[PDB]
């Protein structure tokens, strides 16, 4: 019944060797090699909750008088887009749940990629040969941000409408062809007909298709290079040490997959997001104090706040002050996209790297990363500096000046501290290899000298003083519990003491197990050595 389904599926696709190859691929097990999955799962939730969300939504700007589930706002003249978005939360059973799931998933998606990009950056996974992946991923994050932006602008409420007003007036104030380009996008003056239609047709099709295509290409390209991994015992630059796809990797992927799905289902219910009923229909005259776009869009708005009034008047023409903002954001994007190329120009090393490197061993790049993180965080904080100012009792003018000055001295201090801390971590790593683990046994010698017991990880010469082990690019133990010298040697339940008979054998078995593991790992190391000398 099962032997026969495979028989007549192989007899026609000759897939025995093709499938065996896929199910035997080995993947490195590290918690930081999973952060990419979070983005994938959040993306699946978005496109699935999004499709459900389009069965009840009318993206029209046509004004109507509201009569619906929301008893307030009855009799209020609103757009068709706002009225239907207000209907999918008060007239659709479990529609608010799905709407909130969608928005939460959007947030997680952007944070699922940012953190992933940080992992890629710090560990050096963008090096040869993985630069197409870096470029693809960078395009992915920019498009994700753009997608999120046009998503929350669909309801056409008062808060989102101001975002569109800002965006339109940014475009219109571009040198030379910013007037024609603005009229080409919106189809006329803002607001326009066929403005919520072009955005809705590019948020549920153009961007999704592009994103899906890029993602699929991204994953396939990753599966071709079969990942990267940290330096460790037995692992070289021409092998992958981890677990096979089945039965271990596939199940773990599903398990974590549904974990993310379940977590998004919790926030969708217990936590409110984008309460559009309190915001009212878009009106060009009405505005609110907290008009921040969204967390991933805060950096752009923060850039616009800290840019001084630097207009260039050229007779019959004028360059707005916001033009420089555009220039600056353009530079930040260009710096981010073409990083592998700039890093390898100033390092002069392009040597097909398959082994990762710990952030502590690359202080310049790590420090640049933390420098850039502080830059981004300051822009993000400045983007919502009016809610910071009130809630934390700080002058708003002082906040603007903190943003302005902090963008110069914040990055500088971040670099200095991070560099020093990286070297500090390197130094602590060498003390252990040179002298051994600092055990907490302060013995007094007969003469009266207080001495700390040191545990060597290597062979000693004559009288302690271990032969210094060379750095190996891996994590060195720092405590004695990391060698299992604190392991609980009492099998049983919380109440159950467990029979000694079955308790003796199990400790013996585990002892023989980790002995064999260590033996096989060191044999792998030896193999690499005598392989590398030919």
């Amino acid at each position: 019944s099962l032997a026969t389904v495979g028989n007549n599926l192989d007899s026609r696709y000759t897939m025995a060797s093709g499938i065996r190859r896929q199910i035997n691929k080995v993947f490195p097990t590290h918690w930081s090699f999973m952060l990419g999955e979070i983005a994938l799962y959040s993306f699946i939730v978005l496109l699935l909750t999004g499709v459900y969300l389009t069965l009840f939504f009318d993206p029209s700007i046509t004004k109507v008088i509201y009569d619906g589930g929301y008893l307030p706002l009855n009799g209020v003249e609103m757009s068709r887009a706002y009225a239907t978005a207000l209907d999918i939360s008060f007239e659709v059973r479990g529609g608010l749940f799905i709407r909130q799931m969608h928005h939460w998933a959007a947030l997680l998606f952007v944070v699922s990629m940012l953190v992933h990009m940080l992992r890629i950056f710090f560990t050096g996974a963008f090096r040869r040969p993985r630069e197409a992946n870096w470029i693809i991923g960078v395009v992915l994050i920019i498009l994700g941000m753009a997608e999120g932006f046009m998503g929350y602008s669909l309801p056409d409420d008062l808060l989102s409408g101001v975002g569109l007003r800002i965006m339109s007036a940014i475009i219109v104030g571009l040198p030379i062809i910013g007037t024609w380009m603005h009229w080409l996008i919106f189809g006329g003056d803002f607001p326009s007909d066929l403005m919520l239609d072009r955005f809705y047709i590019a948020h549920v099709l153009i961007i999704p298709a592009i994103l899906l295509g890029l993602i699929a290409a991204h994953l396939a390209l990753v599966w071709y290079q079969k990942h990267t991994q940290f330096p460790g015992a037995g692992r070289t630059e021409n092998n992958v040490i981890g677990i096979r796809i089945m039965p271990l990797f596939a199940v773990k992927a599903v398990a974590f997959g549904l974990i993310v799905f379940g977590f998004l289902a919790l926030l969708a219910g217990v936590t409110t997001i984008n309460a559009i009923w309190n915001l009212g229909p878009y009106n060009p005259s009405q505005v609110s104090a907290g008009s921040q776009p969204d967390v991933y869009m805060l950096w752009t708005d923060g850039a616009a706040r800290v840019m001084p009034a630097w207009e260039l008047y050229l007779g019959n023409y004028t360059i707005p002050a916001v033009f420089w903002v555009a220039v600056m954001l353009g530079i930040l994007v260009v710096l981010l996209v073409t990083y592998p190329f700039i890093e390898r120009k100033f390092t002069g090393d392009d040597a097909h790297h398959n082994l990762l490197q710990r952030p502590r061993d690359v202080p310049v790049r790590t420090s640049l990363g933390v420098m850039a993180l502080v830059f981004y965080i300051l822009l993000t904080v400045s983007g919502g500096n009016d809610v910071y100012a009130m809630q934390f009792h700080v002058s708003l003018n002082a906040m603007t000046w903190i943003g302005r000055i902090g963008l110069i001295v914040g990055p500088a201090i971040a670099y200095f501290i991070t560099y020093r801390l990286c070297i500090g971590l390197q130094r602590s790593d060498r003390e252990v290899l040179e002298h051994g683990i600092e055990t907490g046994i302060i013995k007094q010698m007969p003469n009266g000298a207080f001495i700390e017991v040191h545990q060597p990880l290597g062979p000693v010469d004559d009288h302690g003083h271990p032969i210094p082990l060379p750095y190996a690019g891996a994590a060195v133990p720092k405590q004695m519990n990391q060698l299992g010298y604190a392991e609980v040697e009492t099998r049983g339940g919380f109440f159950g003491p467990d029979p000694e008979d079955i308790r003796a054998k199990a400790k013996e078995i585990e002892h023989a197990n980790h002995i064999e593991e260590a033996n096989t790992l060191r044999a792998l190391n030896e193999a690499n050595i005598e392989r590398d000398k030919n």
Binding site: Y52, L55, F56, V92, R93, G94, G95, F97, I98, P247, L258
Partner: protein, 51 residues
């Protein structure tokens, strides 16, 4: 080697759990369900009662 064939209870409950999860995921599709015989809100207009 997974030793799942021997655990009748684990795989039995796992099946039930997975089915319930699936049904939980697809349940908000019941927001589309509408009773054809429930008259639309408000008094009867010139287009009838909606039924």
């Amino acid at each position: 080697t997974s030793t799942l064939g021997r655990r009748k209870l684990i795989m039995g409950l796992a099946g039930g759990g997975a089915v319930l999860a699936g049904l939980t995921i697809i349940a908000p599709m019941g927001g589309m369900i509408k009773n054809p015989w429930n008259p639309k809100e408000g008094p009867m207009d010139v287009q009838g009662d909606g039924t």
